[PDB]
From TrEMBL, chains A, B:
Chain sites annotated for binding FMN: 33, 35-36, 38-39, 53, 55, 58-60, 86, 89-91, 96, 131
The keyword Nucleotide-binding appears for this protein: yes
InterPro entries xrefs: Flavin_Rdtase-like_dom, Flavoredoxin, Split_barrel_FMN-bd
Annotated source species: Thermus thermophilus (strain ATCC BAA-163 / DSM 7039 / HB27)
Name this protein carries in UniProt: Flavoredoxin
Pfam family, one: Flavin_Reduct
Length: 178, 178
């Protein structure tokens, strides 16, 4: 097993991939934007808190700070092209609001085709190096009827997985319950 | 598409799964513990920062606060049984240090068999509801040659995935690069 001491950013920072990209939806007045975020994680069960790490370089960063409300939606493999397209262009150069979406209960935009989505109120924002963590409280839930299993778990093979640097995949259908 | 307002903890909080479980290794004096953490994410590229969200109920939590150093290791689907075991029992009841492991450059314990691992210096801890986010700086990197690709991602299909509530999988073999 090879090793090295870190001396700055890693030659690839992909060791913990793949991950499910969360699609971050945000609205400020008429303007809707979407941004995939693979740097995402649950943060608390009670209360339900979910976080997304967003670079201050993203158009989405300013919109979140203004809106203080956002969606995180989770999309099937079949939407790989759309998710990659949302993550390869900025709202500085393209109205990604033209992407098919709807407004949730709190008025946050939610990208269409998702098997699940959270509406979130922004609770806190924390800077860690070159990204800011946006901590949202889940205030509403959208779920596709039957793309989730008995305990609320997305069905094997369905989820879009991101491997980093524009490489995508999906879970295998085989599961293990040891 | 079904929806509801959040009224406390969610019936299932698995909408964003599967994820790669990071195995969190920690050492205090002669005592070594491990803890899988599916709530994990990259937090910064420059500098390289990585977070794990750990409940104050975990034996690991106090050890992390004392040691200020830990590992995060990433394991192949073959080690599904070991990873599940480590997150099914507490260091309060069983010496998990007995799991085969080595010490890293900075003396953190790294569980054997990982395709990759970080040695981390603890930078910050933040409370978000019922879990604490431990923000580590990657100070060293371990890689299993030939299990990672050209850019550093684990080879297609190798990663252990966790679906929540004791269910596991792996990524599909096929990858797609739009
Ligand atoms: C699959 C995928 C995952 C991504 N994950 C993140 C992320 O976690 N945080 C982030 O700041 N950018 C991430 N990006 C980059 C942004 O999505 C990308 O810069 C996007 O064009 C930003 O659009 P915006 O400027 O309209 O906000 C990701 C991109 C892709 C394709
Ligand atoms: C796959 C898996 C992922 C887990 N993810 C987390 C996590 O992100 N944060 C956490 O606090 N516990 C998590 N747990 C629970 C701990 O791993 C479990 O409570 C473990 O027994 C803690 O051991 P400890 O008391 O020695 O720290 C997870 C468990 C499993 C099996």
């Amino acid at each position: 097993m090879r090793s090295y001491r870190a001396q700055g950013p890693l030659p690839g920072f992909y060791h913990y991939y793949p991950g499910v990209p969360a699609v971050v939806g945000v609205r400020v007045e008429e303007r809707v934007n979407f941004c995939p975020a693979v740097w995402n994680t649950g943060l608390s069960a009670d209360p339900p808190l979910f976080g997304v790490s967003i670079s201050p370089k993203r158009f989405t960063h300013g919109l979140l700070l203004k809106a203080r409300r956002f969606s995180a939606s989770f999309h099937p493999f079949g939407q790989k092209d759309l998710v990659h397209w949302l993550g390869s262009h900025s709202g500085r150069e393209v109205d990604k609001g033209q992407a098919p979406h709807f407004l949730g209960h709190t008025g946050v935009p939610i990208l269409e085709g998702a098997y699940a989505a959270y509406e979130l109120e922004l609770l806190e924002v924390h800077t860690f190096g070159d990204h800011d963590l946006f901590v949202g409280r889940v205030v509403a839930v959208w779920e596709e009827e039957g793309l989730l299993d008995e305990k609320g778990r997305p069905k094997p093979g369905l989820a879009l997985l991101y491997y980093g640097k524009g490489l995508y995949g999906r879970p295998a259908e085989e599961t293990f319950a040891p």
